[PDB]
Each structure stands twice: as C-alpha cells, then as structure tokens.
Design a protein around this ligand. Sequence first.
Ligand SMILES: NC(=O)c1ccc[n+]([C@@H]2O[C@H](COP(=O)([O-])OP(=O)(O)OC[C@H]3O[C@@H](n4cnc5c(N)ncnc54)[C@H](O)[C@@H]3O)[C@@H](O)[C@H]2O)c1
Ligand SMILES: NC(=O)c1ccc[n+]([C@@H]2O[C@H](COP(=O)([O-])OP(=O)(O)OC[C@H]3O[C@@H](n4cnc5c(N)ncnc54)[C@H](O)[C@@H]3O)[C@@H](O)[C@H]2O)c1
Ligand SMILES: NC(=O)c1ccc[n+]([C@@H]2O[C@H](COP(=O)([O-])OP(=O)(O)OC[C@H]3O[C@@H](n4cnc5c(N)ncnc54)[C@H](O)[C@@H]3O)[C@@H](O)[C@H]2O)c1
Ligand SMILES: NC(=O)c1ccc[n+]([C@@H]2O[C@H](COP(=O)([O-])OP(=O)(O)OC[C@H]3O[C@@H](n4cnc5c(N)ncnc54)[C@H](O)[C@@H]3O)[C@@H](O)[C@H]2O)c1
Lengths: 247, 247, 247, 247
Amino acid sequence: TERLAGKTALVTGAAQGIGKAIAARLAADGATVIVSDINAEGAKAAAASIGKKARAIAADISDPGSVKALFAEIQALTGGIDILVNNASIVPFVAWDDVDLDHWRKIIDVNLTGTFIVTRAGTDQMRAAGKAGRVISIASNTFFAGTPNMAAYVAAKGGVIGFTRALATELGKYNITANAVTPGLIESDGVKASPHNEAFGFVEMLQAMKGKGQPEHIADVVSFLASDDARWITGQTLNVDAGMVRH
Amino acid sequence: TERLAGKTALVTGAAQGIGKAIAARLAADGATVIVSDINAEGAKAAAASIGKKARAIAADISDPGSVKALFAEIQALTGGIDILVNNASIVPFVAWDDVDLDHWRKIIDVNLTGTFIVTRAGTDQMRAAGKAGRVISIASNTFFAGTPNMAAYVAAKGGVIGFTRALATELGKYNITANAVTPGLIESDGVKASPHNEAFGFVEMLQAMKGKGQPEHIADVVSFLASDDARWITGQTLNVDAGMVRH
Amino acid sequence: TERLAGKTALVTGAAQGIGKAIAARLAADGATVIVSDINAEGAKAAAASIGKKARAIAADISDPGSVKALFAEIQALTGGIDILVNNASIVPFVAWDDVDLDHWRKIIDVNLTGTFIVTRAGTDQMRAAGKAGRVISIASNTFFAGTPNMAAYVAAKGGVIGFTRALATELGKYNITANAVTPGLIESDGVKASPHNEAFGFVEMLQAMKGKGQPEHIADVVSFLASDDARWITGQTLNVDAGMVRH
Amino acid sequence: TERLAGKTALVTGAAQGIGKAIAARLAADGATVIVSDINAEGAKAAAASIGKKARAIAADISDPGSVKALFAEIQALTGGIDILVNNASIVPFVAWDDVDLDHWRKIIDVNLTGTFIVTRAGTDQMRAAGKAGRVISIASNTFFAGTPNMAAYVAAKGGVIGFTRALATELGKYNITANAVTPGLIESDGVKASPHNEAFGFVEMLQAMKGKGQPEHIADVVSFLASDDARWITGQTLNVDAGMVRH
Ligand SMILES: NC(=O)c1ccc[n+]([C@@H]2O[C@H](COP(=O)([O-])OP(=O)(O)OC[C@H]3O[C@@H](n4cnc5c(N)ncnc54)[C@H](O)[C@@H]3O)[C@@H](O)[C@H]2O)c1
Ligand SMILES: NC(=O)c1ccc[n+]([C@@H]2O[C@H](COP(=O)([O-])OP(=O)(O)OC[C@H]3O[C@@H](n4cnc5c(N)ncnc54)[C@H](O)[C@@H]3O)[C@@H](O)[C@H]2O)c1
Ligand SMILES: NC(=O)c1ccc[n+]([C@@H]2O[C@H](COP(=O)([O-])OP(=O)(O)OC[C@H]3O[C@@H](n4cnc5c(N)ncnc54)[C@H](O)[C@@H]3O)[C@@H](O)[C@H]2O)c1
Ligand SMILES: NC(=O)c1ccc[n+]([C@@H]2O[C@H](COP(=O)([O-])OP(=O)(O)OC[C@H]3O[C@@H](n4cnc5c(N)ncnc54)[C@H](O)[C@@H]3O)[C@@H](O)[C@H]2O)c1
C-alpha cells in the first residue's frame, strides 16, 4: 500500500540478482531506493530500469573511502537512510584444496568486513538523523548446511549472522532493528553463471516444495522485514529456502 | 491492500489476546475469518467486534468431535479453509514440583495433541478443496530459553515446532506451507491475568528493544506468513520477542 | 578408567539396539546399571549378557504404576539413581495419511509423556538421596531435519528437547544436569527390522562421513555425558549423525 | 587410561587460561602436546609446568610464516599432528561506538582468519601423514546470545562456527572430524584482567547451575571431543555454559 513511502533504503550489490530484485520491491513499497553496487553501470542501469524512486550510487563495500562517499551523497539527497540491506557479496565456487589464504582473505573482506564497513556508516547515519532504522543482512543457508565448495563463504556468512545478533542488542536502544535472511539456492544472475547452477536438481530434491528458488522470493521477505509488521523482530534470522533446512 | 480478500482463515483460541489480535488483522487483510474458541461467548463477542468478515464457531481443539463439527460448518459456509492459525493453548504457571502427571497430560493434550487434531482436519480440508494452504502454529520462545515454572508447556511447544518441521515436508507436495512463530512475553489478556505479568521488567531487561510485548506485534507477523510474500518459507520458525533470544 | 564406579544408572528400552549398547558401555564405565524395558525377557537377557554390573527390571515407561515399582526396587537395591538415560521409545514408519489420532496418541504417550513419567520419578529419587544426578534423554535428529513418514515421532522428540531445556533450568539448583542426544540413522535392531533400514544409502550420501551409524556410536557419547567431563553442560543437545545435520 | 597415548595434539593460545587448561588435560590423556602461543615465554613456561608430554613452540596464528614454521617443526618432531585445538584468540571489551575498522580488522584477523591459517596447515599435515585427525575450534556462546561490548568478536566467532560446519563436510572423506565448542563465561587469566570479570554475578544468575565457569570445565569437554568416543560427531557445536543458553 506504499507503506515505505517517505522512507529511504539503501541496497548494496543491487545491480542484479537478489539485490536488484530487492531494490525493485522496496521501490514498489513506495521507498526511495539507493541502488549501490561495485559495478557502476549495472547499478545505474538497474535504477533506470526500476525507474524513478531509484537512484544509483556506485561503491565498493570493502573500501572505507567509497563507502564514506556513498553515505555522504545519500545524506545530501535524502537527509539519511531508514533501511539498510546488506546484499553485496562474492559467491565463489572453490574446492577446499583451492582455498588460498588469498581467496580466504578476499571473501572475508567483502562478504564480511565489507558488510561491517557499510553497517558502521549506515547505522551511524540513521542514528545521527534520529531515525528508527532497520538493518537487514543477506546471509545464506549454507551456514546451516555446511555446504561444500565454498568454505570461506560459509565462514563469512556465519560471521554476518554473528554480527547481526550482536548488533541487534547493540542498537536496540536507538530503536534500530538488525536482522538477517538466509536464502537457499536462488536462480539469480550470479548463480546462472556459476557452477552452482548445476545444483538445482539436487537442492530441489531436498526442498519440501519443488520450484527453483527465485530472487523475488527473497525480495518479498526483505520487504516484510523492512516494514512495521516486523517491528518486534530483532536479532533473528529468516530462512527462506522452500524447506531445505529447518530453522 | 486487502491481499487476503477471497481467502478463508481459521484462528483458534481467538476470543482474546493474541488469537483475537490475529483474527482482527487477517480480517483487515481482507480475509473472512473463523473466530474459534472454547469460550463460545468470547469467540462470538470477538467476531462481533471484528466485523462482517468475522464469523464465530466455538470448538475445543482437544476434542475430535467438536473439531470435526468446526470444519464441517466451515466447509458449508466457505467451501474450505485457506489459512490455519493454531493459536489456542493453555498458558500455565506451575512450579516444577507442582507438575503432576495430571497437569502434564492436560497441557500436552490441548497445546500439542489439540493442535494436531485441528491440523489434521484443517489440512485435509485444504487438501480436499485443492487449496494451496498455509499453516501457522503459535509456539513460544520459552522453547529456546528453557523458561522455568512451565515445563509441560515448554515440552508441548517444543512438540509443536517438531510437528511443524515434519509437516512442512509432509505437505510440500500439496503446495501447503507449515510454519511456526515463537512469541516472547506478550501483554495479552491471558498474561495480564497470570503471575507471568510480573515478569515484564525482567524480560524487558533481556530484550534488545525495551517495550512491553503486544498482541499486535505477533498478529502483524502472522499476517505476513499468511501472505504470498512468505510463499518460499516452510518449516521455519519466526521468533518475535524484541531480541530476547537470537534464532 | 571405571570413572562410573560407585554410580547407579538406569537405562530404559535397554533390551536391545541403542539402549542395550548404552547399558553395556555404562557398565564398562564401572557403573551398576539397571536394564529396564517393556520386554522383560529381553531386558534380563541383555543384563545377563552385560555382566553382574547389570540388573534387569521390566517397566512400561508410559505406565505410572510400573514406573513407581521400577524406582522403588531401585531405591531398595542401590539407595537411588545417579544417572538417568531415557532411551525407551517407539520408532514408527507411518505415511502422513496413516497418522491417526490413535497413532498420534500412542507415540506421544510413550516417546514423550512416558519420558516425563520416568524423569519425574528418577529426578525425585536423585533429589531425595541428595545425589547430583545426570539426566540424558535420547531424542533424534529428525527434529532438525523434518524427516517424513514419522510426524508424531518428530513432534514427540521435539517435545523431549523442549522438556530437556526447561528441566536443565528447573534442576540446576539441585546440581542435576539434563541433556539430550539426537542420533541420526543407527543400525539398531529396530531399524534393521523396519522400512527405515532401506534409507541407509541415502542418509549415507547426506553424511559428511560415510559409514552406517552404529549403536556404539551413541553409547560412547552418552558415556561422556554421564561423566564428570560433562559437568558444565546442561540444557544442551548433542547431535551425533556423522554430519547429516549441523547443530 | 591414557587413551591419547601415541597421539600428537597442538593447542594454540595455550600459554594460559583455557588453552593451557586444555593442553594440560590432553597431556593427562597421554597425548604429546604442542603448547603454542604468541607469548613464547608463557608458552614454554606452560609446557614446563605441564610436563614432559608438553613441548612449546611459539607462533602468531595470524601470521602465515610463523604458522608454517610451527608445523614444519612439529612434523620433524612427531611426524605430524593428530589433534588440532584452535584456542588462540583476542577477547576484547569494546563499546559499539569504539568499534573501529581497525579494531574490527584485528579481531577478525586473529580470531577468525588466524584460525583458518592454522587449520589449513594443520589439516594439510594430518592429510599428508594419512592421519584421521580431529579439529576442535573454541568459539563462544556470545554467538548465541548476541552479547554486547564485543561485536567484532561475536562476528568472528560466528565465522569460526561457519567455518567448522563447512570444514566438517569438506574433510569427512579424509576421516577428519571438525567440531566447535562454545564456552560461556570462564574465569581465565584473561577474563580476570578484563572488564568481563565484573559480569560473573549476572551470568551466574542466568545460568541453570550456579558456579563460576572454570577453564577445566572446557578442557574436560575438549578431551572428550579429541577422543574416540566422539568419532561419530562432526560439524557440531558443543555449548558449555552451565545452561546459560540452550543449544
Ligand atoms: N543467489 C544465491 O543462490 C545465493 C544463495 C544464498 C545467499 N545468497 C546471497 O544473496 C546475495 C545476492 O546474491 P546473488 O546470487 O544475487 O549475487 P550476484 O552474483 O548475482 O550479484 C552480487 C552483486 O554484488 C556486487 N558486488 C560484489 N562485490 C561487491 C563489493 N565489493 N562492493 C559492492 N558490490 C559488490 C556484484 O557487482 C553483483 O552485482 C548475496 O549476499 C549472496 O551472498 C546468494
Ligand atoms: N502471551 C505470551 O507471552 C505467550 C508467549 C508465547 C506464546 N504464546 C501462545 O499464544 C497463544 C495464545 O496466547 P494468549 O496469551 O493470548 O493466551 P490467552 O490465555 O490470553 O488466550 C488463549 C485462548 O485460548 C482458548 N482456549 C483454551 N483452551 C482451548 C481449547 N481446548 N480449544 C479452543 N480454545 C481454547 C482460551 O479460551 C483463550 O480464549 C497460546 O498458544 C500461547 O501458547 C503466548
Ligand atoms: N535407531 C535410529 O535410527 C534412531 C535415530 C534417532 C533416534 N533414535 C532413538 O534411540 C532410541 C533407541 O532406538 P532403537 O532403534 O535402539 O530402538 P529399538 O526399537 O531397537 O529398541 C528400543 C526398546 O525400547 C522398548 N520400548 C518400547 N516401548 C516401551 C515402553 N513404553 N516402555 C519401556 N520400553 C519400551 C522396546 O521394547 C525396545 O526393546 C529411541 O529412543 C529412538 O527414538 C534411534
Ligand atoms: N574465557 C572465556 O569467558 C571465553 C569464553 C568463550 C570463548 N573463549 C575463547 O577461549 C579462548 C581462550 O580464552 P581465555 O579466557 O583463555 O583467554 P586468554 O586471554 O587468557 O588467552 C588467550 C591466549 O591467546 C593467545 N593469543 C592471542 N593472539 C594470538 C596469536 N595471534 N597467536 C597465538 N596466540 C595468540 C594469547 O597469548 C593468550 O595466551 C579464546 O579463543 C576465547 O575466544 C573464552
């Protein structure tokens, strides 16, 4: 019903897949949405596509300086952020024996410390504008499953959940909620181009319902968590995977 | 925007507290709602209060015969149920040493086997009408916490989550989701009559946010789970307690 | 090193499979072990097999009167119980549509309320003898997985975990711990004689390690929980399934 | 009865507190133990104290080069490692608003990526020697609780559990188990010197049992996980906190 009218949400890694699917929904919810991504072109293509409520600002979540610039510009245009959706991440396919310290470090830096960098700045910004924000970080259900071929990723995602829980309590007093969502396999654009695409049949088997997971499936849940209906929920993780795992 | 228009939802223990708060919200969602309760007067007082969307049918969830009659009548009026909200339960305050086999049996019979009796009939009804239903059972976050003075209740609630998970996979093939919600302390008409009321200050301390939990807090989340936004969620438990526990 | 010398442990459903495997181990730990079972012959065959550390006493965990008689006799012989292992349960294979109220009730009564009946009496007995006991209840990892063809069972097992958590806090002040173990598929006698036996190849696939689960695998863990090494652990659930699920 | 005789175990951060308590116990189990720590003097003081089964080798878990040197020397002396206990970590007390990118990075680097660096090398070493190893990583129950004043730490520890789960499946085929333990508040030498010490009375309240947590409490559990009794357990987290949280 355009419940999010008047609100400003930021989505990272929003140039495609789930991030984009989310930005699109929040916009449909009436919010003005900052489509952020490391891919400046994709970001602004996506915002053009979303259209009007959507504004593109490129940023590398793992770089402190571009994240500062990200938020500065948001403050200017909107006076601050009401909703933060930590979506940007690297989704690797790496056999255990290919897991380098180098690989490890990159995945951790983006998927994990990158989300702190942004959350640090974003919550500071809500706090400064006296807004009762919502933080929502996209994790993964690989954390519950111990999925193979992506150890650094599962660690980092474990990290994001840890972070989420501590943050919830850390920010409760500022009326800011912090939650996480664990998507199962989703037919984003990242997966379609990923060895991971080959796993749909096997994960479908393990699911209680039997479609292929779709970005809108996660977007529609983020939309709820960003809404007032989810006001009494903080520190929780929503698992969205057609019953792959039970949480 | 009345997304639940055309749908029929049944809420048990709906004469007051959370059940009523839920029936009220689902009606606001546009659904026609069967307000069911063991307290026939309260049920029908509550449906009068709700509106023309609400209809009262009294039933003891722990009695097979009254649950049969509950559903028969629903089939007649509506051709079947789309949404099931297992809310009816007994919320005891019993010191461990007062936990009788007798007390144990009563709590288990209603809070647990009573929810099976209804779910059995309700999902059969959806199934028979070829409706892609939603089951939502109200558990409790005492299951995560191991809360004292209510051991039978915590077992039964553990049971409802167990049930929920198995059911999810059991019904996935008929396009029926089954989920659960674990409310923390809520200032219901029930609680207000309980010694439990005295615990608000302590639980508020442990919460990340600092209000007293309110029935509308849980109703608003049930409303989401009943909606299409939650279509990719089955077998999961939503914990709603202002950050009391982290799930 | 016979750490359990001087201690008295009771194992229910101990005539075969895991219960027997456990009684055997606890006896090897030096404990005198009451082998209890509904099958009087099996129980006492098993105790004969185990040695002179083992004594057989038949009992139906779901019957309050035979449970009373069970413990009275134990008090006489040993002056009370130090360790309680709730093992006795019914392991069904029932398609959802065969799940009767009748089936439901039977499974709940034994697997769940039966374990309360015994735990009530057992912990009272420890308490009365001023013993700092250990309660250990065998659940199942189907509770984490939402395994199909056994809905009543998954609910009851959910219940036992609920019970366990509440009990931990309930008895902490009497220096009594209460824990639970969730075995995955185990090649016990009942499994071998049950449509469940056919699932070994599939569950082996999902396991991180690739043997068939063996009763000694669970017995060896119970032995630990019954020991002083596990003294700071209460309210927890040990999941033992070669990595089927991650808990 | 010295079950760990013949085995070689490495413990990091083993100069004091839990690490030392663990090294001591594993040695008592008969294992030859590498007492590793960033504090070379503490490490070798601790091994002198422990005994002749204990050997000290200093190393910074967060530095790849010293970790290489750590394991090379172990290979020389023992032909490789059978058991790995990731204990070394930084236990901070930082108010949210003091959480720097700089602070964040340090905690993540040691507590999380430092445990990868060691696990990478250690498991490679077991693998190379054809040994069916055990990995045990000490996390924290703050991950379940969302404890405040230590957000970077709670994230990292979340990460260690993530890592653990993925690793379990990653190494199951080489007969190597990987588990984690979540200690609650423990009265170690670090904690005694931390503003965390002041929290004992509060955490004691929330505990089901009411002592102050002791390093031996965790050591005795690690000992079990290192033993054959825990051979069917991989990808699991043992929570040891006197019932603070229920896992
Ligand atoms: N899609 C899945 O099946 C899968 C499963 C579970 C969870 N997830 C999570 O969902 C989210 C979206 O996944 P997806 O599959 O849609 O991803 P995707 O690969 O389709 O797109 C991710 C986007 O993130 C951006 N990005 C990468 N690094 C960045 C950084 N340094 N700074 C800013 N932006 C960066 C990329 O440019 C890309 O456009 C991710 O957090 C992922 O962890 C994905
Ligand atoms: N209030 C809380 O803090 C709390 C927390 C977690 C979960 N819950 C759950 O929420 C649900 C309702 O909560 P509440 O606090 O509003 O309870 P309440 O006491 O305020 O109302 C419960 C209603 O259930 C009805 N009922 C009792 N037995 C019945 C039967 N056999 N058949 C049909 N109806 C029956 C009662 O008549 C009553 O109208 C319960 O399942 C309870 O377990 C409550
Ligand atoms: N084997 C598995 O795949 C598996 C998996 C998860 C959990 N479990 C649990 O392990 C435990 C043992 O399983 P199992 O396969 O060894 O069982 P089993 O069928 O092989 O033997 C269990 C014993 O319990 C007894 N029993 C049944 N009802 C009783 C009653 N009311 N009172 C007293 N005794 C009764 C039976 O007579 C039998 O001797 C059970 O609690 C089960 O729930 C087993
Ligand atoms: N004690 C608790 O309340 C508590 C609770 C949960 C988990 N833990 C975990 O247990 C472990 C030890 O706890 P503690 O109370 O003994 O802390 P402690 O401060 O007494 O000792 C930790 C040890 O880690 C070592 N260390 C630090 N950086 C290192 C480096 N990079 N390389 C090698 N060693 C390094 C230190 O020298 C120290 O000896 C830590 O992992 C901590 O996270 C502690």
